[PDB]
Design a protein around this ligand. Structure first.
Ligand SMILES: CN1CCN(c2ccc(OC(F)(F)F)c(Nc3ncc4c(n3)-c3c(c(C(N)=O)nn3CCO)CC4)c2)CC1
Ligand SMILES: CN1CCN(c2ccc(OC(F)(F)F)c(Nc3ncc4c(n3)-c3c(c(C(N)=O)nn3CCO)CC4)c2)CC1
Ligand SMILES: [Zn+2]
Ligand SMILES: [Zn+2]
Lengths: 290, 290
């Protein structure tokens, strides 16, 4: 039922709707372009018909509120929002190379240098978020978008929350994140540490080629996370394996903090590419010297 | 994509598909009738296109396996199943008066006698299930169907499980039941007691007109159940209020067992109608003497 042109009274700007990119939650995303400046964007379009309950509205509202307040090289740029009477429209930075999920589907396990490269950017993005007292709470591969340079941009703040005062422990998380931290499952209160947990799973998945706690039943997976049941393959280098372990610990107080991470031996003693070639979307790089 | 006639090779029987009744989970339900004996049935029709994963298949399979093994006045009769290459078909006892959910929407709080009447039947149905080592695990209003006589028939065994040996504690429940017991949320293992818990909520809802632990966020509701946060209105009779309390306790070992229930003062000292008039679908009964 979505209009072909998206008009924002108050900004003046108009947007031609273009190609579908996908659908997550109540949203559909489209390439759109500022009919004037011809600049291209990702547009996230939620029908108000799925927002009849105040609780669902507040969530949509809270996502815009958090996302709007953020600007950083490795966070998906927020360029505005508006609504007509049937839709909410959110205009976001377009990432022309999809997400780490599609990369991982095509390459499974990456080379260490690739993993250093992406994890660094994920971590810088997340250092920014924690610095601003935002927990993302659903960092996973399909939320980690890639622009035309294969730079990471964290996106989808629909489960993100704001830490409102020191020592606050979030008691609930309304949603079912992918790489979900143990203290969320055991409802003991959670904070910034759940993100470091998710990055631990991401690091495992990037290095190993599969998620750490996969099973066929989601409820078994939860159980595994609860008991910290996972094993790191023997071929994963020990420095890398060490860092995975540090992050994937049941005790949130035990895990490194987002700022500790880039000082880990894993980064500081390994080669970190300055940039990757597009070939690496499909072909493992050998990082040859000349 | 569903055929207009449902044919079961092996039984011979054919069924004309008829009116939609509703849709829960992967299923759609239709009135159907044995094209020969003209007998009418409820048909539950699941598309194999939503059953591609082995885990989803096993659940469908487990529901038929449990439901098929059951016969009782207050359980929805199982009359067979079959499949073609695109659908599973399950032929069930038709309940022409929908469920306690539609009754509750129309009447909110019932009179005590009505509540005794329905709870008795729910309990007899459930005594049968426990006798056969089946936990239902999602007893709620929309699962409690009513035939043309306003007799209760427990239905939907899609979260039901079989207790395989004495003292077994089910560790997981793959699904999100409505009136969900605390020990399921705190993953401590659960057994027959979760059903008595659900009947406690049903009793509260039938007497009070709203569920005991309602909030606007499901995750807040869980939290409330976890801490046993609910209050019984002062006008609910004390005997009734007592029985609600006995059933809605955090400690599963503390709650009555399905067989203790009908001996409770709530039943044995109150008037229990032998039957209700259809008027009570819409009009509160006064149970006058002549
Ligand atoms: C899981 N996969 C699905 C497909 N993906 C995919 C596929 C194509 C894309 O565009 C281009 F072709 F230019 F590369 C892009 N690029 C792209 N760029 C910016 C955004 C999105 N996608 C996006 C967002 C959300 C959200 N929830 O907030 N979902 N999607 C994406 C809609 O899902 C936020 C803004 C991503 C990446 C994520
Ligand atoms: C939540 N409400 C929805 C509407 N209901 C409703 C409405 C109309 C009905 O038929 C008649 F008109 F004759 F009364 C009936 N009667 C009816 N009778 C037998 C069955 C069902 N419905 C049924 C089942 C399931 C399941 N999951 O296993 N879902 N539905 C029902 C499909 O949802 C199992 C077998 C129920 C009762 C439950
Ligand atoms: Zn499961
Ligand atoms: Zn919620």
């Amino acid at each position: 039922e979505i209009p072909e042109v998206l008009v924002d009274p108050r900004s003046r700007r108009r947007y031609v709707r273009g190609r579908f990119l996908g659908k997550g939650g109540f949203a559909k995303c489209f390439e759109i372009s500022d009919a004037d400046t011809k600049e291209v964007f990702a547009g996230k379009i939620v029908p108000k018909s799925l927002l009849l309950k105040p609780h669902q509205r507040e969530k949509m509202s809270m996502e815009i509120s958090i996302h709007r307040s953020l600007a950083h090289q490795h966070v998906v740029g927020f360029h505005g929002f508006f609504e007509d009477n049937d839709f909410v429209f959110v205009v976001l930075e377009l990432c022309r190379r999809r997400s780490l999920l599609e990369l991982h589907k095509r390459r499974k396990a990456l080379t260490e240098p690739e993993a250093r490269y992406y994890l660094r950017q994920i971590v810088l993005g997340c250092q920014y978020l924690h610095r601003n007292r935002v927990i993302h709470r659903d960092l996973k591969l399909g939320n980690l978008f890639l622009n035309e340079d294969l730079e990471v941009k964290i996106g989808d703040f629909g489960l993100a929350t704001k830490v409102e005062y020191d020592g606050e422990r979030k008691k609930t998380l309304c949603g079912t994140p992918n790489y979900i931290a143990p203290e969320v499952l055991s409802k003991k209160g959670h904070s910034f540490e759940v993100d470091v947990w998710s990055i631990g799973c991401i690091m495992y998945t990037l290095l190993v080629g599969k998620p750490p706690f996969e099973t066929s039943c989601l409820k078994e997976t939860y159980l595994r996370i609860k008991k910290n049941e996972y094993s790191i393959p023997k071929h994963i280098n020990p420095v890398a394996a060490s860092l995975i372990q540090k992050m994937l610990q049941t005790d949130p107080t035990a895990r490194p903090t987002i700022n500790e991470l880039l000082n880990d031996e894993f980064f500081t003693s390994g080669y970190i590419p300055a940039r990757l070639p597009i070939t690496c979307l499909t072909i493992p790089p050998r990082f040859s010297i000349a």
